[PDB]
Structures are given as structure tokens and as C-alpha cells.
């Protein structure tokens, strides 16, 4: 079980469950990149093929999610929203860059463990990179 790149699960388990769009939304965010980036400019960089890892997976997972149509206690675990973080980590790291993404995760992880009296009322915002 791993994340290399410079982060750990212990970092991503700080960002709240509303920091992330849904699974399918992020699938649209990837279809606007792997389609508009990976083969459009020729760059093979690790975050695109890492997307394809996870994107494929969630495919070979929700394949099971439709294969539970063979049952009727089907409470199928959507705790696989641990992909939403994963899919975010690459997507953001392929727009802002792994530099700014890991830096953001470190500062946010620092701000969460800071008692609220000594910190700004709002966690760090990840600002977009402009035109």
C-alpha cells in the first residue's frame, strides 16, 4: 500500500470529504486532460499514467458494482471515495504541479494540527494558477 511522490495517506486524510468533487466529476476532469493532454501533447509524465491506473481501477471496481445485480442485501461500499482523493492528488498535481500540491498538503496538514486560537479561522486555500 503506498503513495510516493512525496505524500502519504496521512496527508490526504486531512483534507475534508467536501474538499473533493465526486468520483464521476473527477472522471470528467480527467477526460478533459488525458484526452486533451496525454496524447494531445506527447508528454508521458507519471501523473497521466497514474491517472490511467486509478481511472481504469475504478472501472474494474464499479464492474463489480454492476455485478452485484446478481443478488437482496446490497449495501455496496462507496468508501471507495478514497479514490476521490487519489484522483484529485494527480489531477491537481498535473495542473498546479507536484511542487505546489505537496506544499499545499504540508501547510494544510500543519494548520489542522494547530489549535484554532493560534491559527486563521480558514484553512489555506489552494489558489488557481492564472492565465
Amino acid at each position, epitope marked *: 500500500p503506498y503513495k510516493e511522490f512525496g505524500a502519504t495517506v496521512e496527508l490526504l486524510s486531512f483534507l475534508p470529504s467536501d474538499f473533493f468533487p465526486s468520483v464521476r*466529476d473527477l472522471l470528467d*476532469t480527467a477526460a478533459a486532460l488525458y484526452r486533451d493532454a496525454l496524447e494531445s501533447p506527447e508528454h508521458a509524465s507519471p501523473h497521466h499514467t497514474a491517472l490511467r491506473q486509478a481511472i481504469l481501477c475504478w472501472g474494474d471496481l464499479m464492474t463489480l458494482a454492476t455485478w452485484v445485480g446478481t443478488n437482496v442485501s446490497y449495501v455496496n461500499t462507496n468508501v471507495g471515495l478514497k479514490f476521490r482523493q487519489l484522483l484529485w492528488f494527480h489531477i491537481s498535481a498535473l495542473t498546479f504541479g507536484r511542487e505546489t500540491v505537496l506544499e499545499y498538503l504540508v501547510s494544510f496538514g500543519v494548520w489542522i494540527r494547530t489549535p484554532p486560537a493560534y491559527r486563521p479561522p*480558514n484553512a489555506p486555500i489552494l489558489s488557481t494558477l492564472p492565465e
Partner: single-chain antibody
Amino acid sequence: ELVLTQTPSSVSAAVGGTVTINCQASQSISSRLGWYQQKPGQPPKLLIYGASTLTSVGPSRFKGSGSGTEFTLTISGVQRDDAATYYCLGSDTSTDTAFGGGTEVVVKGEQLVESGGRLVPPGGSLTLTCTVSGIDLSSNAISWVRQAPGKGLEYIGIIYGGSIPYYSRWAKGRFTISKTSTTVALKMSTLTASDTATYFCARGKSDGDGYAAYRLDPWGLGTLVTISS
């Protein structure tokens, strides 16, 4: 692509009667509809989210119901206060996210600052600012909606806490949403007269699985953009 077909076109009702507004979406949107009240001159108010669950104001005489396709909003005890134009904002995804056509029911008997809107001649560009106060932009979405004079609400886009924007199909590439330290910027390129409207931003509150596009509260007062040659 999503249509919310909202009927009827207008309800003519009296005091004490029961008023029903039906919204039939085009896809399976799950429980992700929302029900909205717009009084003239005011921003949109959230009545119901999640197709049933009421917000912290809406009176118990309002009731929402339905799921997946059929969604129906009912008013048991309607008074004169409830006479206004109601809209269903359904969300399939953050891209297919669509307002309803609207229904004006007529009966007888949280700091967001939109700015930057101005007059621009056709073909130019304009950048709207939503100055957000009291809201955590790391935990909440900011959606942009517009309304033309005498027209309904038109979902432009949204941006999540992950600083990831989403735009509907008509707005694609012509609009781009940005997020900064204190603000959310809606940039509009190749400006036509189809875009002259009043632009609101609102705070989306995420679903358990991360769908914020259909629960938009609160709203700002808007900013006006008008285009003519």
C-alpha cells in the same frame, strides 16, 4: 445532457389551497434535486435540498418529494408570502447541472459580494468577482448562475474546495472560473448580447459523495452585465 422540465407555466391559486409544482428530469439524478424560491428584486432562496430535506428556514407547510426522475414540490397551507417564482435546480453532475423552467405561483387573499459587472460592447471580455466573507473556500463550492431580464436562472458553473472548476455545456471555454485567496473570479470571453444578465454567485455545500451543484445557499445580490453595440 440534462433537461429539468418544470410544469406548469403558472399556478393561479388562492389562500389556504394546495399548490403542486412538478419537475421531470431527463436522466437519473439520484436524490440530488433542489427547490428554490425567487421573489422579484431579490436573490434566489433555497427552499429544499436533497429533494426532501428542508433548510433552516422553510416552513413545514412546504414539502418536497420524489427521486431519480420525478420530483414534486407541494404547498399545503399557502399564504400570500409564498407567491413567487419557484425553480428546480437538478444536478446529474457538475457539468450536467440544470435549472428548471420556473413556475410563478400567484396567490390572492454568509456574505458574498458580486462586483466588476459593467457595460461592455459585443466581442470583448469581462471579469466578475465574488468576494467571499465568512465562508471556508477550502470546504465549500462557489457556483455562478446568471439570469437574463425576464428570463430564468441559468447555471454557469461551479468551483469546488479543491480549486477545480466545472462549467455547463453552453458556457464551455467562453467562461472560466478562478479561485484566489479571498475571492472567486468568473472570466467571460468573446462577449455576446446573449450574455447580458444578472450574475449571482452562491455557496454550494457538498453532498456526502461530493455533489454541491444542486444545493446553493446563500446567494449574493448579483452584479449586472449589459452588452450592446
